[PDB]
Amino acid sequence: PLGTEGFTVIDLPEVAPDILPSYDRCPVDDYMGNGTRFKRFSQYKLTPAEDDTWSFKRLPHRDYTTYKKFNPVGGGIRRVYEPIEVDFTPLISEGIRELGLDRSEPWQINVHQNRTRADGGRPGPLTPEGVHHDGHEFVMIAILNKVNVAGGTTRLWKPGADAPFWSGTLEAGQAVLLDDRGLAHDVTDVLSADGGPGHRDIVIIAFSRWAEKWYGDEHDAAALE
Amino acid sequence: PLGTEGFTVIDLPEVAPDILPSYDRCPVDDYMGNGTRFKRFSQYKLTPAEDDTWSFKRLPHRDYTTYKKFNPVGGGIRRVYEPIEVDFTPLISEGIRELGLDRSEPWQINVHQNRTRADGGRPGPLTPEGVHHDGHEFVMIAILNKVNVAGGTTRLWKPGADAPFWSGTLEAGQAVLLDDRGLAHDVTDVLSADGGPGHRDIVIIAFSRWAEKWYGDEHDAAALEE
Ligand SMILES: [Mg+2]
Ligand SMILES: [Mg+2]
Ligand SMILES: [Mg+2]
Ligand SMILES: [Mg+2]
Ligand SMILES: [Mg+2]
Ligand SMILES: [Mg+2]
Ligand SMILES: [Mg+2]
Ligand SMILES: [Mg+2]
């Protein structure tokens, strides 16, 4: 599992050939990134399955809801997104393996398929909410492709720190796994590398025990206050 | 002037009949509000003129730039807006009078013509930057029209406080004048009043001494951190 200071960076395996092209078919995110962001969203139930296997079950598609206390810019509202088309679960399995997720109860995950674009005039903001916790137990952020972009540096922060204790620009084929409770994080804006268009394609997976799931009417009611 | 708490709420005079309709012709703000905000932007020089009067001069139109230290969501970038069509300067003069602006040097103002829309599913964020200072010496926020909205409550905060010391929902025909340095502010989201569409039309005027103007290549370099 995570290495003493509550995060690990891993290399990801090769991904199925449909995954990278699917980012072209993600519709604009109407709620975050002011036109720079494109998004699909699905939710899964994670159950331990026999000899060290985890099974994934796609849940009925629902609006995304989070708390303003975790995301003041995009929280407290129903965010209507389309489902993810492709299958990120083999990639996610790598994070489950590196986290060594507690097999003693089932888990629930949010899966964000995010493209952020940058251009000469206009960086692509990755965490306009700033330094923050997502509100879950664990978070996995995986980079699937970067084209003509600089910046996009992940920074990890201890509670109350004036400066991050760790920084690193995650590249295509890398993922960071983090204790989303013990650590906060932000990420610097995506910058156009040469003045022309560029983009950064990622997946964010937020892990919560099913008993604390971010799914259903009770969660929605709480997140929307 | 403002008075000991660093803010005052004033009533505004009647406005010319072109002001309220002009809000229907503000294009979408591409940089803030995620489609809920519509905006035009102009900058003026304010000079002390004879007879205890103030002269307004509209400056050559330039992209808006502000600092990330004041606006982390919309700071540090060139924001290309279209100029304001109508003339807010009579309304601004009510603010200058109430502020008692220091006549000993000229001033420069940023003028933001803002419409925020709310709908049943979708509140209209007014200060997604959160509690903040705009970075200027004084700020005037005037409400020109509210249609079918709730929320939109202005909250004023002492530096570093964990709760605001004053709150008020400003209505059409009201303006708040504030010490943008000694106080921070935020505003609660615009809410649909009945489930249908609604909107809130305002102008924000940020006052800075000309010697510290938020205009021109040097300000831009500083705000963009170039
Ligand atoms: Mg998003
Ligand atoms: Mg944005
Ligand atoms: Mg992002
Ligand atoms: Mg969240
Ligand atoms: Mg915004
Ligand atoms: Mg601003
Ligand atoms: Mg506003
Ligand atoms: Mg500002």
Q: What are phi and psi of A202, to 5 degrees?
A: -140, 170
- Counting runs of H as helices and runs of E as strands, what totals does chain A give? 3, 12
Q: Which of B140, B148, B133 is nearest to B111 (CA)?
A: B140
| Interface contact flag, B128 A33, Cβ < 8 Å | no
Q: How many angstroms is it from B128 CA to the middle of ligand 7?
A: 9
* Cα separations in angstroms, B164 against A67, B81, B167, B186, B190: 21, 32, 7, 9, 18
Residues of A in contact with B33 (CB under 8 A): 34
Find the distance separating the first CA and the last CA of chain A, reported in whole Å. 34
Run of H or E including A98: helix A89-99
Residue A213 one-letter amino acid: K
Using CB atoms and an 8 Å cut-off, which of residues 175-204 of chain B contact chain A?
A: none
Count of CB atoms situated within 10 Å of the CB of A4: 6
Give the separation between CA B129 and CA B149, rounded to whole angstroms: 21
Q: How far apart are CA A201 and CA A174, in angstroms?
A: 12
Q: Running DSSP on this structure, what letter comes out for residue A22?
A: H
Enumerate domains of chain A plus CATH numbers: 7-224 (2.60.120.620)
Which residue out of B34, B63, B224 would a mutagenesis test of the A interface target, given it has the greatest number of A Cβ atoms within 10 Å? B34
Distance A116 CA to ligand 1 centre (A): 9
Tell me the technique behind this structure: X-ray
Q: Which residues of B touch A121 (CB under 8 A)?
A: 77-78, 80
> How many Cβ atoms are within 10 Å of A100's Cβ, its own excluded?
9
Joined together, the tokens standing for residue B114 give 């803002």
Q: Does B69 touch chain A (CB under 8 A)?
A: no
Residue A219 has φ and ψ, to the nearest 5°, of -60, -50
CB-based contact (8 Å) between A27 and chain B? Answer: no
Residue numbers of B between 116 and 175 with CB closer than 8 Å to A: 121-123, 125, 128, 130
User: In chain B, which residues have their Cβ closer than 8 Å to the Cβ of A28?
Assistant: none
Classify A214 as helix, strand or coil: coil
Q: How many CB atoms lie within 10 A of CB A153?
A: 16
Residues of B in contact with A155 (CB under 8 A): none
Please report the DSSP string for chain B in residue order.
---TTSEEEEEPPP--TTHHHHGGGPPB-SSSSTTSEEEEEEEEEEEEETTTEEEEEEPPP--B---TTT-TTT-SS-B--PPP-S--HHHHHHHHHHHT--TTS-EEEEEEEEEEEEBTTB-B-S-TT-SB--SSSEEEEEEEEEESEEE-EEEEE-TT-SS-SEEEE--TTEEEEEETTT-EEEEPPEEESSSS-EEEEEEEEEEEEGGG-S-SHHHHHHHHT-
Residue A22 CA, ligand 7 centroid: distance in Å: 36
A33 sits in the region (left: phi over 0; alpha: psi -120 to 50; else beta) called: left
